[PDB]
């Protein structure tokens, strides 16, 4: 399908729902990937945004093709001299080691 959709497996069939956008004006991306303690750093940076015009803060994990996931279950062990590349629409983010921005 040309438009993005959400799908899952229900029994032997595939159930597909619709999709709803969020407030694009209020979007924040953390520039630090270091979490609490050690060796439990987040695999992907967190994104804070809101839904439509409702005044409320929502924090989730950025996915692929400009997708927001509310389940922050993506964790990985800290690795020295790491490097990360992310693509958001027509922009790229380069994360040296586990911090900074480019």
């Amino acid at each position, epitope marked *: 399908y040309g438009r993005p959709v959400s799908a899952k497996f229900v029994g032997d069939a595939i159930s597909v729902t619709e999709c*709803i956008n969020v407030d694009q004006s209020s979007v924040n991306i953390h520039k630090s990937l270091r979490t609490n303690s050690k060796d439990v750093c987040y695999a992907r940076p967190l994104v804070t945004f809101k*839904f*439509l015009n*409702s*005044s*409320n*803060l*929502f*924090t989730g994990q950025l996915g692929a093709r400009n997708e927001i996931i509310l389940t922050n279950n993506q964790v990985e062990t800290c690795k020295d001299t790491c490097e990360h590349y992310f693509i958001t629409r027509n922009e790229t983010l380069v994360y040296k080691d586990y911090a900074y921005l480019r």
Partner: antibody
Amino acid sequence: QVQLVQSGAELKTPGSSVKVSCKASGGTFSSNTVSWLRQAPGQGLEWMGRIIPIVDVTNYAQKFQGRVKITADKSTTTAYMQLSSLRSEDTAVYFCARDDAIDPFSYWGQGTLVTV
Amino acid sequence: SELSQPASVSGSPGQSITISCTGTSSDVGAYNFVSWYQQHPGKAPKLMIYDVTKWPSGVSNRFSGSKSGNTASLTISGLQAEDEADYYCSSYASSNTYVFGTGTKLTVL
């Protein structure tokens, strides 16, 4: 001018299950988030939990995980909060606030008094 | 990690009263969504200060707020009237969790 309606006070034995229903006026729930806040007599305020029906996502406090169940209905625009194993100090008033484009909780209900 | 607020603050007519609100840097020191709510005895809470210092619509401008470091201060200049509603300080925290202050009671002569 969205109005909130809360159920009347109910008496339940300690350790039982208490269900509170909050009705929201207006057209529909839309993107608004419905939050529940309890206030003890003479005490402060704390955040219990919230529900967003657009994604049907419930956010709970770290001290109330697994004890409070929050559900919403897209047809009757009614939110149900269930808290079983009610303890004595649990007795308090309950408000079902609503998020607004100006700021969240911009609205407050009548309140439900729960006595243990 | 509930926010800490003064138990009570004195006051007098024709005077300005400042109420402080401090907490962990993870909630108030990382975001700028602090708010102050006034609650009358036996009445629903009312919001008068939101965001950082922007006033809402259809409210008195005698109240102001300013957040410095990890501490926010709400200053009121309009004395007289009632000025008896309890003030509570709230802020946004991580993990999609909200917090509220203990509460501040204002007394006037």
